[PDB]
Symmetry: C3
Amino acid sequence: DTAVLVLAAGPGTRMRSDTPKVLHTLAGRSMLSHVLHAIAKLAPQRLIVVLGHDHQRIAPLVGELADTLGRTIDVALQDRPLGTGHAVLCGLSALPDDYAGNVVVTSGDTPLLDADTLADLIATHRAVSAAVTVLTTTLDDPFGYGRILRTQDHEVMAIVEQTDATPSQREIREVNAGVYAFDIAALRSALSRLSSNNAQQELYLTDVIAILRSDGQTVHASHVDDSALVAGVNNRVQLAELASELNRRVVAAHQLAGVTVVDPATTWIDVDVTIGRDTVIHPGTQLLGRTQIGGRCVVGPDTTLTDVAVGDGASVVRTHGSSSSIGDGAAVGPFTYLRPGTALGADGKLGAFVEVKNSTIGTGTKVPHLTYVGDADIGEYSNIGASSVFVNYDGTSKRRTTVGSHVRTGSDTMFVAPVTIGDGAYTGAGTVVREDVPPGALAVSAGPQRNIENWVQRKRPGSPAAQASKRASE
Amino acid sequence: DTAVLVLAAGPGTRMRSDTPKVLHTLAGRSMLSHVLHAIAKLAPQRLIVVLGHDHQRIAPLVGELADTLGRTIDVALQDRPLGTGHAVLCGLSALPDDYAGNVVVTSGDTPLLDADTLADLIATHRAVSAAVTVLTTTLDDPFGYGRILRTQDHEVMAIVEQTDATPSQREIREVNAGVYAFDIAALRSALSRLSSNNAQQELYLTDVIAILRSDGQTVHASHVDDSALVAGVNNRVQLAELASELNRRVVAAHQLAGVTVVDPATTWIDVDVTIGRDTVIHPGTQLLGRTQIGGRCVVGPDTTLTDVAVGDGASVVRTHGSSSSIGDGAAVGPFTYLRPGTALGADGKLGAFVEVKNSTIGTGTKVPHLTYVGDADIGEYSNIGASSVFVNYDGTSKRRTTVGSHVRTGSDTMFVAPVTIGDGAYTGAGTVVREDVPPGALAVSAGPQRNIENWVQRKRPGSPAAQASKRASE
Amino acid sequence: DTAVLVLAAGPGTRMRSDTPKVLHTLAGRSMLSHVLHAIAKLAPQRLIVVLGHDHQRIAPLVGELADTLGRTIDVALQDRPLGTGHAVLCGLSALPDDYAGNVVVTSGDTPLLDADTLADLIATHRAVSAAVTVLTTTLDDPFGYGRILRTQDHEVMAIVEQTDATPSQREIREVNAGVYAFDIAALRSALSRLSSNNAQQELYLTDVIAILRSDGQTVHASHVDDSALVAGVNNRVQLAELASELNRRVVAAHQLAGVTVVDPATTWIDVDVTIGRDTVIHPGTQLLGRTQIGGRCVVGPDTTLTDVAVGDGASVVRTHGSSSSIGDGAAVGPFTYLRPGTALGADGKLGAFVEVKNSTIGTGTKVPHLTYVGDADIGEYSNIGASSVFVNYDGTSKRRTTVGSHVRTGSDTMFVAPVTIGDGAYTGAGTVVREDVPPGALAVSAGPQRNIENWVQRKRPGSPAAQASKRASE
Ligand SMILES: CC(=O)SCCNC(=O)CCNC(=O)[C@H](O)C(C)(C)COP(=O)(O)OP(=O)(O)OC[C@H]1O[C@@H](n2cnc3c(N)ncnc32)[C@H](O)[C@@H]1OP(=O)(O)O
Ligand SMILES: CC(=O)SCCNC(=O)CCNC(=O)[C@H](O)C(C)(C)COP(=O)(O)OP(=O)(O)OC[C@H]1O[C@@H](n2cnc3c(N)ncnc32)[C@H](O)[C@@H]1OP(=O)(O)O
Ligand SMILES: CC(=O)SCCNC(=O)CCNC(=O)[C@H](O)C(C)(C)COP(=O)(O)OP(=O)(O)OC[C@H]1O[C@@H](n2cnc3c(N)ncnc32)[C@H](O)[C@@H]1OP(=O)(O)O
Ligand SMILES: CC(=O)N[C@H]1[C@@H](OP(=O)(O)OP(=O)(O)OC[C@H]2O[C@@H](n3ccc(=O)[nH]c3=O)[C@H](O)[C@@H]2O)O[C@H](CO)[C@@H](O)[C@@H]1O
Ligand SMILES: CC(=O)N[C@H]1[C@@H](OP(=O)(O)OP(=O)(O)OC[C@H]2O[C@@H](n3ccc(=O)[nH]c3=O)[C@H](O)[C@@H]2O)O[C@H](CO)[C@@H](O)[C@@H]1O
Ligand SMILES: CC(=O)N[C@H]1[C@@H](OP(=O)(O)OP(=O)(O)OC[C@H]2O[C@@H](n3ccc(=O)[nH]c3=O)[C@H](O)[C@@H]2O)O[C@H](CO)[C@@H](O)[C@@H]1O
Ligand SMILES: [Mg+2]
Ligand SMILES: [Mg+2]
Ligand SMILES: [Mg+2]
Ligand SMILES: [Mg+2]
């Protein structure tokens, strides 16, 4: 049995944000959410998040994740950020006084941390009967991290913080990941002996290592080769680095599963996105939220999709869209804007400079150019001519349009809702449609063409046009 | 004299694709095509591709390349993938039984392999009178590759496959490139002695090394410092890595020749693309197929061009286009879509939200905004007003429009083909042009403006508009 | 007291450009301009730029920077590029013959060089009373650079040029940065003894080191750990590398100050750009020139902004724009084109496929779709319907439109300037507005809808439309 505590009550100063650190996102999830998904996979008996003065903005997101993960997540409050050691005391207060399981401590800012690394930590801690096992790694740039002090035999003696380390300790490149397993009694005991006598003037959880070494307890440091899994995030440079690294891993997983990603460095794929076999994702693409792509699709470059379902064989190129679905075999783009509530049927087409909002568009139906579709239902195998608008707003209110199947509407038609265009109807180029159109009818409104001869010589003489026109007489 | 065999009959399982591995593209060519271009530059006497159960989809592409490279390329069939050693036996069957030239073996999945490396391999093999010379390299991550076994004197003893290697052999970082020169007799002899007694249960070409060492033949391994040249591709992660590396080399070549590429990491340049001196390519650009850019052009960011010819001094910004040509000094973009058959004359302009298909557009002519040009011929120094459409499709059929020179067509004109607009003609804003327009004439159709006074107070009271309008009385 | 000489008179052959090297830009400044900003921060007494045969195109930019930096910058002419040693003699000619301050020499192609490194160089040179102090660094790839010759005690003996170096000297990885401090007398003396007897056949400034060592003068080489600060640019590959590295540093500075940059590798930020706290910049974005972004903005991906001011809380997504301003809380994009002279008020909206030029657009006013706004003034809380055009050009001349406040103009309105639309006015869908519209009036022009029944059966039989329409009878 084990309790996991997640310390998330620090002020996050180096982020320089009014958004609490923990809540900063990479790959579709907040760091906190990443940390909690990871721990919930491990299924510990207790899971406690220690929150600080902004608990009121985080505690509710904690409940949301508790509900998603199908479990109970407690919140402990740390009313002043007196240090990671103090934070752990707060977290302990949320366990029974006689709790006898192991205590794993982790941070809310170690977003790649994964259930396997935590299970390994707990297994190791048990195998060697440690009073404390700490995870460590070794980095080229160790700046900011606690340094792991070891004798030549590899026994850990202490951890020393960046701010308290001599120039010589600072050369150490093995660092504290801030991820620990503890025997509960040993932890409580050593926490009670902590002193704020140090540079930052805090109660350091890291002191517990040297304390327990002194007591003659067993102290184990377990080295994590894959540094990324235990990398922290204290500022926005580190956040983009880990987002980038997490993204590489997500992209590689999709590649090994049969998805061709032309340029992984510029293809951002959120963690819940699924993509079918043999799809091709061109550079500059973001697939966000719960986006789902079928198999054999082309995801045209420079495409951003958030919560969009794309069926098999579809093509989605230079498109910006969200909360929409794109049927099998449909063609979308280039330069297309899908707003929430777009439903494009199989083999449909939304072409260049087309914007769709809250509209359903039947099988086989094409909106190829320069057109706005708002609040409409359009049937099957219909064609909406270029440069048209579904006028869904009269000033003051929202109005609906219904277009039948096999319709051909002429270029530059304005559908002034509410209006219904019957099956097989046509609308001439340049029509303002204010009344219903019966099935099979032609609707027109433009007046007759009138050619005014010699207008150019008479109203624009001797413009380049008047001269060209005079040459044409000959 | 030398015969080159290219083994391309394996199943490509780790690609997880219904597209045969060899046929996967980087930089405008299939890997197979890359491998064959490289070999054909070397001009060997015989060149044989060993194909497997999907030979019917590859053999024809082989003929295409034979025809392009001006040479004969034979195909040998391997009806079951029994191993690289077995594959080479298949390839040999396509040589005369008394062939006495050297045999070079290579894979169809080593797409950076180049004629210089192959010529070096053949020269070395000859200089040392080896029975077999194998190319090797050394990598940070040797996973998947055969390991090169050498005594402390650097003599090669054997090659051992990833799957058959002890944990200790796996530490070796010098790997088999899968690129060999053989004395024909030595090869035939050693191939006949191969055994399927190993992890993968195949006839390994790699065993030939240890076999010939045992026979007391001369065995040479030649180390290739530039690893990329001999890197293989077994899955889509490795394919994107080599595409990325190949792309860096193509971009650097254009840079050293006088082309400023703002961000090489995001500029994808196919191998046949040519670009003139002092052009600037902004980030996010792909130049594909047989695209040709003149000198002093600007290739606006986020541009994708496939088979597009761009003359000197042109500007092509945020544009998506294919099979089109863009004259000297023309301006295209931002947000412009060129479909096949676009011909934009010198100093022409295709502006924002303009889409052109199958149209010729004369010198000096401008289509600046929000417009669709389909199946049209437009003369010189003409201006097409904003928000216009060449209505090229009547329902049921494709129709053509001809526009003269020095024309000025008004905004929101619909050209309902087939129609001809004479030289120097104008068309008022809002015109639906259904009849020919004589040179120098003004064509109009919109009815007269009618101002209905007090409509807002009476039909939208006291909307914000009614209130504003009531304030304006005062 | 110290004089800084900047050698910028070489021919820049390896750039293969008709644009003089020095004038090639990264991050919004020419390399020369970068070098001069850096030196002017140091505030030396004299600053002299040595120019060559293209002095006439550079000398004026030098005056511009002199004027911006609030100082005097002299130009010395080198009429033939006889070598860096000869160049320095030219530069000296612009100092009094009795000048007694230190001479710092630097290149015009070391664009990351910074005032701190130069101050350190001068302090070191003084601390050790050197006759010459040279800056050096150590690189993985030392190709092209002079090699630093040192005895085992670390005393510098000489510098040897790439072209004159034995294969063994070429293994040296410590290189000359081309950045020197000199005692003036020692420099003049050693320059007079230079010989053109070497591969390139030039007067090498680098020979001065071995000369002064021989004289028994003190010679100091000061090692710069951060190589980038002293990296040179001789060709366009090196220029993109340093632009990339400079960009990383600019982006990291904004990140540490509170700006979330999703993908630093694809976010290009010029050196004068400022960005407020908690803004988010999505991938593919360039912020150029004097662009200024407020706090809490979203800079939608694929956005390019040059000299654009964006207020707080604004959103700017998939937008291409320049010389424009975007008010607090405004929404711009996706797919929007801002031309010079755009002023979008607070809470304004410019939506998808909208292009604006030289127009002022009041608080709260919305141009949501498919529309061109040219040469217009539009008041507050107005709405411009979809697919509209401000027709600002009559053929021959530029015309202005004024639109009041709280106006609602219908879709597909053409504003044929000059025209004024009064407060609270409406314009029906499909209107060509040629006359002024009074406050509160409705302007229309389209003719009445006419439904021609059975047109489809009679003019398109038995098209799919005729069949659908016949089915609808039942
Ligand atoms: C998206 C693209 O880029 S192309 C795709 C979608 N399409 C289009 O714009 C197709 C547009 N085509 C048109 O508007 C055409 O003029 C068509 C199909 C309606 C005209 O068909 P037509 O049969 O050739 O001539 P027709 O004589 O039958 O039409 C009869 C009546 O309507 C009129 N009329 C025809 N088109 C229009 C129009 N666009 N506006 C106003 N009136 C019109 C006539 O003037 C005629 O009336 P009348 O009997 O007073 O003369
Ligand atoms: C792309 C851009 O953003 S701008 C570029 C391209 N251009 C345009 O849209 C320019 C548009 N301009 C127009 O339509 C203008 O009204 C112009 C140039 C035709 C009007 O010119 P005008 O000479 O000022 O007035 P004019 O009195 O001569 O025209 C005469 C006839 O056609 C009419 N007419 C003029 N413009 C139109 C029109 N757009 N629609 C219908 N009828 C019109 C009159 O009502 C007049 O007929 P009448 O004699 O019954 O009165
Ligand atoms: C941007 C978007 O996607 S939506 C946003 C901006 N908006 C729009 O396009 C809103 C467009 N709406 C329209 O054009 C509408 O027809 C409205 C609001 C003007 C019509 O309002 P209405 O009050 O319903 O009918 P109404 O009877 O009052 O208008 C009266 C007169 O003008 C006419 N008329 C109305 N709209 C138009 C029009 N678009 N073109 C020509 N004439 C028109 C009538 O035919 C009537 O004249 P009459 O008295 O001969 O019959
Ligand atoms: C003294 C200490 O522990 N330092 C460790 C901490 O450094 P680091 O400087 O990263 O410590 P932080 O400031 O990030 O705080 C640790 C975490 O605990 C929480 N918190 C912090 C302070 C507090 O008073 N209350 C509270 O709840 C914060 O949410 C934070 O996420 O993690 C590093 C790895 O990431 C380790 O190398 C360091 O050894
Ligand atoms: C046993 C063997 O040779 N392994 C080599 C092979 O590994 P690797 O595991 O890459 O070998 P592959 O599975 O790629 O097969 C080699 C190539 O030969 C062809 N093929 C393969 C099997 C077959 O039965 N018939 C056939 O024609 C395939 O098209 C393939 O392209 O290349 C590596 C470098 O890339 C080398 O380091 C390995 O030493
Ligand atoms: C002989 C010499 O000095 N070589 C140095 C030079 O190499 P490198 O080959 O880069 O020297 P360059 O050709 O760049 O010339 C140096 C600079 O001086 C100016 N110039 C050059 C030649 C001339 O006749 N007149 C003139 O004014 C040029 O503007 C140029 O910017 O810089 C390198 C670092 O960047 C150093 O490692 C080399 O030791
Ligand atoms: Mg931290
Ligand atoms: Mg009309
Ligand atoms: Mg392989
Ligand atoms: Mg240089």
